[PDB]
Design a binder for these strands. Sequence first.
DNA 1: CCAGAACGGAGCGTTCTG
DNA 2: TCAGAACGCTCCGTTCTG
Lengths: 74, 73
Amino acid sequence: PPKLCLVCSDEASGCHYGVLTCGSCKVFFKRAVEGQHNYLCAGRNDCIIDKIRRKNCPACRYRKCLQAGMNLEA
Amino acid sequence: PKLCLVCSDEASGCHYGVLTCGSCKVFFKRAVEGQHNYLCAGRNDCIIDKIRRKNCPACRYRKCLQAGMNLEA
DNA sequence: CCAGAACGGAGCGTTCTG
DNA sequence: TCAGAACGCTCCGTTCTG
Ligand SMILES: C[As](C)(=O)[O-]
Ligand SMILES: [Zn+2]
Ligand SMILES: [Zn+2]
Ligand SMILES: [Zn+2]
Ligand SMILES: [Zn+2]
């Protein structure tokens, strides 16, 4: 019964930064929190984040990582 | 103070038949020749501006066409 | 099993040329 | 004039490494 990334719903590879996620979201989040995450949504801050569309809006993908509970120290 | 009709950045000239910037010029060339189809994460209504145009190639491309951008022109 | 690094690919935007 | 090539850059995601 495949476990699913809580950010993007791709198949999860494990528990990363405290949350069931895929590898791309693990490493997106690491990039976002270390960089200057000055991301802008071109829509209404409710973009659909899935495997096909997660590249599209880092702002909304980052928000979802935060709402899911991701954090570096866990 | 002429502005790109796709993204409202500073326009560099007339490209493919529309007053556009350089990034929109080359983006549209790439979009057309490359047959890759895009999908909006929002509502096919994204705000395309200097910073946000990176975010939705689907909406940016739709705007290039509605502006009348055209190869052979 | 997980974090962090590395690596190759894609896309974007400038610059230069004629 | 503007079309096009090309390059350096950022970001992405899979794979390694510790
Ligand atoms: C294009 As790939 C499989 O190296 O992310
Ligand atoms: Zn994911
Ligand atoms: Zn968004
Ligand atoms: Zn433009
Ligand atoms: Zn869009």
